[PDB]
Fold 40S ribosomal protein S17.
Amino acid sequence: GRVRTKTVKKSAKVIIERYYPKLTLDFETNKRICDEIAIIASKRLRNKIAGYTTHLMKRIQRGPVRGISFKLQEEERERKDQYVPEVSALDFTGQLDVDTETKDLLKHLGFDSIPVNVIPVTQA
RNA sequence: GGUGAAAUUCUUGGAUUUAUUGAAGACUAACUACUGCGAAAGCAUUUGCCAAGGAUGUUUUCAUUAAUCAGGAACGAAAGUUAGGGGAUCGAAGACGAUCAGAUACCGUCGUAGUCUUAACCAUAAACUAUGCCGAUUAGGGAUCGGACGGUGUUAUUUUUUGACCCGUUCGGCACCUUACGAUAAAUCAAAAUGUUUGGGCUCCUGGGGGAGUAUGGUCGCAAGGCUGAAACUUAAAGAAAUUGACGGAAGGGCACCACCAGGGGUGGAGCCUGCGGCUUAAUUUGACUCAACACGGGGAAACUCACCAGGUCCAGACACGAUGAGGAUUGACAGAUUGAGAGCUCUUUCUUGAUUUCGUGGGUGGUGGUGCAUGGCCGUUCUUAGUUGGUGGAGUGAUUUGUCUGCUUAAUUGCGAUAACGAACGAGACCUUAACCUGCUAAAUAGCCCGUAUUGCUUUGGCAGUACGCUGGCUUCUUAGAGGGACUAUCGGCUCAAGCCGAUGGAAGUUUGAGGCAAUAACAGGUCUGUGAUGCCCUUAGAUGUUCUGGGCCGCACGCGCGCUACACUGACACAGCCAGCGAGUACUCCCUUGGCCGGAAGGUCCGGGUAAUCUUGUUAAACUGUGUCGUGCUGGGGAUAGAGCAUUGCAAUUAUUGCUCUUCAACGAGGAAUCCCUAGUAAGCGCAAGUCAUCAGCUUGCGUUGAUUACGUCCCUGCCCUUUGUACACACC
Ligand SMILES: [Mg+2]
Ligand SMILES: [Mg+2]
Ligand SMILES: [Mg+2]
Ligand SMILES: [Mg+2]
Ligand SMILES: [Mg+2]
Ligand SMILES: [Mg+2]
Ligand SMILES: [Mg+2]
Ligand SMILES: [Mg+2]
Ligand SMILES: [Mg+2]
Ligand SMILES: [Mg+2]
Ligand SMILES: [Mg+2]
Ligand SMILES: [Mg+2]
Ligand SMILES: [Mg+2]
Ligand SMILES: [Mg+2]
Ligand SMILES: [Mg+2]
Ligand SMILES: [Mg+2]
Ligand SMILES: [Mg+2]
Ligand SMILES: [Mg+2]
Ligand SMILES: [Mg+2]
Ligand SMILES: [Mg+2]
Ligand SMILES: [Mg+2]
Ligand SMILES: [Mg+2]
Ligand SMILES: [Mg+2]
Ligand SMILES: [Mg+2]
Ligand SMILES: [Mg+2]
Ligand SMILES: [Mg+2]
Ligand SMILES: [Mg+2]
Ligand SMILES: [Mg+2]
Ligand SMILES: [Mg+2]
Ligand SMILES: [Mg+2]
Ligand SMILES: [Mg+2]
Ligand SMILES: [Mg+2]
Ligand SMILES: [Mg+2]
Ligand SMILES: [Mg+2]
Ligand SMILES: [Mg+2]
Ligand SMILES: [Mg+2]
Ligand SMILES: [Mg+2]
């Protein structure tokens, strides 16, 4: 079968992890890319590397792949992480719906001032 | 009926099967559980009676009455014994039927004791939790059984109790799950912990393996036997738990035409070569004996090769010492006769050299002599499959293990991934050679094409391999050969997270594009001492196991085997005609490849010449094959074995025919038993050619081309291989 070896996969990932904007989905252009940037001196190996590189580039157009950054993702996950809604989900805006034992803890701890709504506790 | 398949057996007297009923004896299915009771052995239908028991609860009683126990006693599965009853089923022994070499067994049909019960014995089980009884302490957790307690809500009853279910606490049980502050040699253990920091109480047993739970004595038993229980003698291990391999008629997964399936072509059925043993001895030189010996030693031996007799040769015994020795000492070669002899070896004479030499003592050289079980090197094989190894980290006291893997994927330890491993090195792949593409580049009189010149034959009206190196201006499609490009699964449709897989399109090429080369760790007592001045040791070294010469032998022939050639014909044989390749080789002290002319029936002979090679042999005009005829279903014009005669060639030599040609002779063989080999596309098969060997001989091998298929594209059934789990009493490793 035609299963590519690690020397092809690992090298191609380094190409994508570094030269993503220069690469594209065209094999013929990707063929010329490997000429300038890599030192293969083996037409079969270079064709395999360009062929496997093109395969992942078409995969990138869908959201995959894990573990091959591709720094354009890195800058993207930065802005995903920084995102935050202005209204906290912990806001009480019926304010705090807890049970009999929880409110008892508030009395014990000396904080019997929270707008606590005591709910019943039963077993079905 | 019964079985892997059968048979013994029953059956038209109705077997087996169907329904109803009856009798007999045994047993108590499903419910049935990591549940219960009992001191253990054991105990599973209902009901009644009889006696007993643990746990629970207790603000009841006694007050040390307790624990363990040598002898002693009760109970004690199954089998077995005695005397009755019963006797359905099953079933020791026994009889048959199969299987098998045997089958006193496993398998099947019968079948006695027994299996069941009352009375009386027996007292042993892998009677096991292989783990004595009492007591205290020590990590967590959830189930479950019995009792008790507290709470909650449904459900059935109820003058609000009780049962079922739910949650929790506690006592007492059967167990279980994770962990190691601990234990052990380890497997593993909440006990096998609280033990070299060694003492809570009591009883029993053991002291390397056998002999041996045997002999004897005692005692119990109706008996079978039980309990108690040695010694002589023998032996360096036996044994326990784990580890890595190997093996398995163990399981899971995956592969291979040196495996099979579907097929194709063979071999095994005479004769050829000795390719392999007896016989002759000078010998039929010798090595190799499953794959991994037997057209192998590139081993197609006339002489040589040669290693298997005779005859000679060796200061082809270097060098050192001594003697013959300075009256010359030493020493060899000729001629005739004998002696094969062409060594004067013998009868004689000539030269002769002077310690170049001849003997003796040491020491060397040579040996296709032995040892491949002393070795190097090389090759083959394990093993053509995908496997192997450190470093740091983790587990284990240790051998060692993880890394190197559950799953999917791949031809692949190939990847995607999971992950006490991370990061790497080999092998695979990658790489190199070769085949297929380029009307793109480079450039060719040692390759071609077009153009033109001269000329030939028909037409003469334009067409012919037409023919002709300095006959030629241009070009490189064909040919040659360098750089390059080209395929990377490209695109599309599906499955899938991925790795990838299937189909179609385009493309010269889509199985890794086809075929090879190289090819890891470890090993074999694999082969080679007969390749080597590559060698250790042993043997021999003047009547040689050195060397050379003649002849013979390696070929000898009742017999068995292996690799092959030709055939058993009509899809054919023969005669003419048509008529197309590729890989290659070729001349110096002597002829290598050979053209053309001449002679001959053929093999051949002769003469002038070409080629040290894209130039000449050579377009190697190969064969198979196609066309037209003869033959005719006859072992026949198939087949060419054996043999007779003659003629040439190579060689110094052809006899046991080297080989070639002509005529004649015309054997088995009509498709091949039990068995067995190779093979998936330009492949099998058929057909030939060149090279190696070579003065001559190719039925052999290495390559090349021509014609060119049937059938899978799957599997683990046979034979083997790879990985994992598992078992092992194996490690010389299932021979
Ligand atoms: Mg009947
Ligand atoms: Mg019960
Ligand atoms: Mg029952
Ligand atoms: Mg009671
Ligand atoms: Mg006992
Ligand atoms: Mg015991
Ligand atoms: Mg205790
Ligand atoms: Mg309990
Ligand atoms: Mg309870
Ligand atoms: Mg219990
Ligand atoms: Mg002892
Ligand atoms: Mg003992
Ligand atoms: Mg053991
Ligand atoms: Mg196959
Ligand atoms: Mg075979
Ligand atoms: Mg077959
Ligand atoms: Mg021979
Ligand atoms: Mg083999
Ligand atoms: Mg010969
Ligand atoms: Mg000879
Ligand atoms: Mg050897
Ligand atoms: Mg060797
Ligand atoms: Mg390590
Ligand atoms: Mg370590
Ligand atoms: Mg350690
Ligand atoms: Mg290849
Ligand atoms: Mg050798
Ligand atoms: Mg000799
Ligand atoms: Mg001789
Ligand atoms: Mg052979
Ligand atoms: Mg044949
Ligand atoms: Mg003919
Ligand atoms: Mg030609
Ligand atoms: Mg020849
Ligand atoms: Mg040969
Ligand atoms: Mg076992
Ligand atoms: Mg052993």
